[PDB]
Write a structure and sequence with these properties.
The structure is cut from a larger assembly and holds eight protein chains of eight kinds. Chain C is of the alpha+beta class. Chain C has three helices and two strands; from the N terminus they run H-H-H-E-E. In chain C, strands 1-2 form a two-stranded antiparallel ribbon. Chain D has one helix and no strands. The longest helix of chain D has 18 residues. In chain G, strands 1-2-3-4 form a four-stranded antiparallel beta sheet. Chain G has a four-stranded mixed beta sheet with strand order 5-6-8-7. Chain H is globular. Chain H has a single domain, classed as 3-Layer(aba) Sandwich (Rossmann fold). Chain H contains six helices and seven strands; from the N terminus they run H-E-E-H-E-H-E-E-H-E-E-H-H. In chain H, strand 3, helix 3 and strand 4 form a beta-alpha-beta unit. Chain H is an alpha/beta fold. In chain H, strands 4-3-5-6-7 form a five-stranded parallel beta sheet, with helices on both faces. Classes of the chains: A mainly alpha, B alpha+beta, C alpha+beta, D mainly alpha, E alpha+beta, F alpha+beta, G alpha+beta, H alpha/beta. The interface between G and H is medium-sized, with 15 and 13 residues. The complex binds zinc ion. The site of zinc ion (ZN) has 8 residues of chain E, from helix 2. Zinc ion (ZN) binds next to helix 2 of chain E. Chain F binds two RNA strands through helix 1, strand 4 and helix 3.
Chain lengths: 132, 82, 71, 24, 101, 129, 218, 216
RNA sequence: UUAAAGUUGCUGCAGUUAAAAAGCUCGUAGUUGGAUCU
RNA sequence: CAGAUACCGUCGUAGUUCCGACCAUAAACGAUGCCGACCGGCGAUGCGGCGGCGUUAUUCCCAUGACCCGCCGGGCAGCUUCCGGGAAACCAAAGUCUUUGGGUUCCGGGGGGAGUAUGGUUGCAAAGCUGAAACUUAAAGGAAUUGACGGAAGGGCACCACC
């Protein structure tokens, strides 16, 4: 069965982590890249490591990978994460509130707020699951 | 503590918890020295002053560290009545 | 638990000696059967006459014959 | 086992109660 | 060393329970201890359903179901593997097995 | 039933102490209990307390400082000679530096020390430290 | 050479913390042995209380290792106690020296009577309690020396407690429990609230909040 | 608040709260939390008393402020509803975040690369992440938290009684904390409404990413 | 024979599983008993 | 079955059942005496009470009942927790114990010998209650820990296992 070693995956992880700019989606490209970048004995080791660099990068383009934190990708997430719609979702001309909420507000002398709409209390009381 | 001559013979003077008055252990690692900042009453900005509190490990596990902190603040006036 | 009252005293004393009879040692000493069965009669030593010479096999884990006398 | 040697003890005791009778 | 807090039986706050006869065994066991398994199934089983369904004089005749209450002495259950032993912590969980998918 | 009110009281305040609480409701109450808590209070081991009066038996509500480690009663009340006091306080008390045996005496209810002054003996109540 | 991996350590190596008591004041965990070693000193010596071999059973046979009990005192200020397991005896020993150097407690000392000179004994009678072993230290009149079994006597000696009346009930044979219990006793001495400490505490700036600026630099 | 008219809560904020629904907790109530509770309405939902909430916010604020170097404040969110919120909060405040998995033994272990010794600890939920708190037990960290009507107060120091369940409530609470600590530091102002919108501190979900990316 | 023995325990032990709480309740002596009166 | 006066099976006495007189023993077990005080929560339940929108017993008024939401006092229990214990298993009592004293009854003193001998006593009888010693012996024992094993329950691999 074909499965990658600790050495394979860890090495490919650290390599991709540091040199990510230099890598590309071609096997041979990153092969000749890894013959330079790091120091590896023999061949099969090298080829395998590079192969997982390739595979790992094919997975990178889809989205975030659990094992590596590349850089600027904290800044790129700072970009993506930063967003806002023209108006806040917190802004509504009418918000509905229960009579008791209006009471707790009336204690805080906010019972004069304009945006409020008092909504009718539900007549049945069942909040609970029927045990059994 | 003090001998007949009035000297203080001791290694150090331990600190008592603010809430429950218990002595805080030399090694009690659940212990808390908390610092609460003092505002300037006119502005709302930072003074450079603070009131400090101490809570031992015991009350932390009971979780009543919270309530103690609170009525401590009330007693110091850093929390409004009600 | 134990009875701690002031006027309780006799209860304590009585019961104490009565549990005291359940100590193997004290029983042996103050009963007097022990003294009676003793071949010595409580003496430290006893003079005797030699009837015969007897070999005695040692207990299990170690092997020897102990040289003994029937007196 | 306990139950059985209790039983055996009662057998033996009955037998001793027979072998020594108040007539002896 | 006490094994179960409840001593294997459901008995609490009462002195003695009515004894019952094992389904499989005939071995006498008190009702509280007795492993009870209720069985609701069909009189005729899987294939003979589609078989007999065709031989009927009635249309849309629903097959009767057999209902049987079962009592097993502790032994018999572990034999039939109706009940199997579990780990010290996992024992504590009296929530019934997930036959509901 | 309930006997030796004092005992239960002291158990209560000590238990509420170990837990680390501020206030106690100890019920019911007696003059004895009251003076007791008073003697404790003057040394500061406890604090100030308020007697709620009821038409049966009073309830005492007590304020606390953490300074009280152990508070206890000795039942039965033992008759204690002036000679004997030493052995007692060497037995009950943590150190010769602090802690008090409370005895009821003909003079009144007080510390072992105060009674060493007044040159009196009496019956023993309890202790604290 | 010693490289500080913690803020406390760096604060120590840079001479920003004058005494050890600044640490005990705030009950900071001490994660390094070179703090304790830097602070004191030649004043430190240590005892090998016991080496007990222990066996684990495997399909192979009995695989054996060693528990070293080490008691390291500074006569008059502090004690420490540590236990280490290892396959090799030496390693277990020095490892346990690190272990006991990590756990060091100051010992509060009282007067038996009228207060004159320097404290010779425990402040009041205290109870260390470990695993069916109950060790009880009581103050003793000046000069009576330490009355006890050898093992807690070692501790109390290095603790700089000159005189104590010791009672010990339990199964006292097992060494670990004995040592750890009497140790518990001399730990609890600064946990006992006497009328002396009834004064309200004036707080101080914590070593982290005071030197935080010098910590940012390194 | 020092009961001062400065820090006293304005109506607008109350509107933000009433919008994000932070005043609505679960059906379960801890006997520690009853202090902050207002009253239970029908349908079993406990209603949170908001003035008390605000005061706790300010207390926690002064608490954060009092630390000199801002990096000594650690801010941790286990679950997803808080990730981004924690990120932005730390970004503005200059504190050290941990988002996602909090690696156990972070605080207590000198050899790890994760090791740090924060002066204060701020946490999204007590129920979800117990780990950091139980560490604070070992290292002497004071602890700030957001409690629902049901949370254990064990090893929490100053608690903030809000709704930590819904995304909006969480985002808003974080943002408000940021606003408060910042207006406290002397930076920004008590006058100008803050530039940064509370909406930035919300939680995405993949559905909204898809909606707004496929709207463009 | 005394201490060690807090292994006769009043100070001071124990009685779920190690030795051990009577099957259960009633009951005379015995022991013990709430506040409260300068 | 080597052997089964045993497990399996067919037959089947005393007994199992009722009434009237004896017997007084069980792993009669929560293996945890009884009265009392204090000490964290949380949902459930049984019984009585108190209060509360809303459903229902058909359409409106009060009773009353069924659900539903709470509060109070007893109960059987449960779950939870660095309350504290504890040799540990575990225990909100087995907690409030060298910081040792709320009241009281019963009761244990290494293991065997032995719950035997004897006397006394109760019974129609089987037995019950009270109950030794001579001698013997370095352990017997309790929790938990790694092993190894099981004719236990699970998985797992191999053409020196099979298909
Ligand atoms: Zn069966």
């Amino acid at each position: 069965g074909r499965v990658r070693t600790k050495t394979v995956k860890k090495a490919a992880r650290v390599i991709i982590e540091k040199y990510y700019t230099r890598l590309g989606n071609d096997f041979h490209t990153n092969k000749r890249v890894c013959e330079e970048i790091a120091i590896i004995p023999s061949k099969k080791l090298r080829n395998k490591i590079a192969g997982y660099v390739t595979h790992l990068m094919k997975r990178i383009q889809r989205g975030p990978v659990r094992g590596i934190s590349i850089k600027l990708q904290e800044e790129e997430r700072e970009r993506r994460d930063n967003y806002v719609p023209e108006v806040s979702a917190l802004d509504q001309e009418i918000i509905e509130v229960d009579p008791d909420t209006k009471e707790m507000l009336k204690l805080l002398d906010f019972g004069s707020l304009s945006n409020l709409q008092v909504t009718q209390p539900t007549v049945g009381m069942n909040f609970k699951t029927p045990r059994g | 503590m003090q001998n007949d001559a009035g000297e203080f013979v001791d290694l150090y003077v331990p600190r008592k918890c603010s809430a429950s008055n218990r002595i805080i252990g030399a090694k009690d690692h659940a212990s808390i020295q908390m610092n609460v900042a003092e505002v300037d009453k006119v502005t709302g900005r930072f003074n450079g002053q603070f009131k400090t509190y101490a809570i031992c490990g015991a009350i932390r596990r009971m979780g009543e560290s919270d309530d103690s902190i609170l009525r401590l603040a009330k007693a110091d006036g850093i929390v409004s009545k009600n | 638990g134990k009875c701690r009252g002031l006027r309780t005293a006799r209860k304590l004393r009585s019961h104490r000696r009565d549990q005291k009879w359940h100590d193997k040692q004290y029983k042996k000493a103050h009963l007097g059967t022990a003294l009676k069965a003793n071949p010595f009669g409580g003496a430290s030593h006893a003079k005797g006459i030699v009837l015969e010479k007897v070999g005695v096999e040692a207990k299990q884990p170690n092997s020897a014959i102990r040289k003994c006398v029937r007196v | 086992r306990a139950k059985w040697r209790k039983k055996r003890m009662r057998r033996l005791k009955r037998k001793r109660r027979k072998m020594r009778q108040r007539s002896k | 060393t006490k094994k179960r807090r409840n001593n294997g039986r459901a008995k609490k706050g009462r002195g003695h329970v009515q004894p019952i006869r094992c389904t499989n065994c005939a071995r006498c066991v008190p009702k509280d201890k007795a492993i009870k398994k209720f069985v609701i199934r069909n009189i005729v089983e899987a294939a003979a359903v589609r078989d007999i369904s065709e031989a009927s004089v009635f249309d849309a005749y629903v097959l009767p179901k057999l209902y049987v209450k079962l009592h097993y002495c502790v032994s018999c259950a572990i034999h039939s593997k109706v009940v199997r032993n579990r780990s010290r912590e996992a024992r504590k969980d009296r929530t019934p097995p997930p036959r509901f998918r | 039933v309930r006997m030796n009110v004092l005992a239960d009281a002291l158990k209560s305040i000590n238990n509420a102490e170990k837990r680390g609480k501020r206030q106690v409701l100890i019920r019911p109450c007696s003059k004895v209990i009251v003076r007791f808590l008073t003697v404790m209070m003057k040394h500061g081991y406890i604090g100030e307390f308020e007697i709620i009066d009821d038409h049966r038996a009073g309830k005492i509500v007590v304020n606390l400082t953490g300074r009280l480690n152990k508070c206890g009663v000795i039942s039965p009340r033992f008759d204690v000679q002036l000679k004997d006091l030493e052995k007692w306080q060497n037995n009950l008390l943590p150190s010769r530096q602090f802690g008090f045996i409370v005895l009821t005496t003909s003079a009144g209810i007080m510390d072992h020390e105060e009674a060493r002054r007044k040159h009196t003996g009496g019956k023993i109540l309890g202790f604290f430290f | 050479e010693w490289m500080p991996v913690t803020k406390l350590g760096r604060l120590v190596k840079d001479m920003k913390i004058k005494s050890l008591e600044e640490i005990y004041l705030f009950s900071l965990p001490i994660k390094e042995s070179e703090i304790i070693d830097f602070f004191l000193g030649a004043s430190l010596k240590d005892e090998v209380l016991k080496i007990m071999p222990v066996q684990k059973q495997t399909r192979a046979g009995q695989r054996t290792r060693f528990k070293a009990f080490v008691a390291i005192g500074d006569y008059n200020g502090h004690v420490g106690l540590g236990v280490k397991c290892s396959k090799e005896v030496a390693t277990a020993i020095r490892g346990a020296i690190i272990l006991a150097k990590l756990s060091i407690v100051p010992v509060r000392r009282g007067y038996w009577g009228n207060k004159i000179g320097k404290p010779h004994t425990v402040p009041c009678k205290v109870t260390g309690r470990c695993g069916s072993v109950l060790v009880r230290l009581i103050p003793a009149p000046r000069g009576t020396g330490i009355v006890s079994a050898p093992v807690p006597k070692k501790l109390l000696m290095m603790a700089g407690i000159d005189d104590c009346y010791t009672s010990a009930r339990g199964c006292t044979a097992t060494l670990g429990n004995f040592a750890k219990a009497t140790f518990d006793a001399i730990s609890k001495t600064y946990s006992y609230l006497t009328p002396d400490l009834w004064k309200e505490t004036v707080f101080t700036k914590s070593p982290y909040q005071e030197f935080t600026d010098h910590l940012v630099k390194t | 608040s020092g009961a001062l008219d400065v820090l006293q809560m304005k109506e607008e904020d109350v509107l933000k709260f009433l919008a994000a629904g932070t005043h609505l907790g679960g059906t379960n109530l801890d006997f520690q939390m009853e202090q902050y509770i207002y009253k239970r309405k029908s349908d079993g939902i406990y209603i949170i008393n908001l003035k008390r909430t605000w005061e706790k916010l300010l207390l926690a604020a002064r608490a954060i402020v009092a630390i000199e170097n801002p990096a000594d404040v650690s801010v941790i969110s286990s679950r997803n509803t808080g990730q981004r919120a924690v990120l932005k909060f730390a970004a503005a405040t200059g504190a050290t975040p941990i988002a996602g998995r909090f690696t156990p033994g972070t605080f207590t272990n000198q050899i790890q690369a994760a090791f740090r010794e924060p002066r204060l600890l701020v946490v999204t939920d007590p129920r979800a992440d117990h780990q950091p708190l139980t560490e604070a037990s070992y290292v002497n960290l004071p602890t700030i938290a957001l409690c629902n009507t049901d949370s254990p107060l064990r090893y929490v120091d100053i608690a903030i009684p809000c709704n930590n369940k819904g995304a909006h409530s969480v985002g808003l609470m974080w943002w408000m904390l940021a606003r408060e600590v910042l207006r406290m530091r002397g930076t920004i102002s008590r006058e100008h409404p803050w530039e940064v919108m509370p909406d930035l501190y919300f939680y995405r979900d993949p559905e909204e990413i898809e909606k707004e990316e496929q709207a463009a």
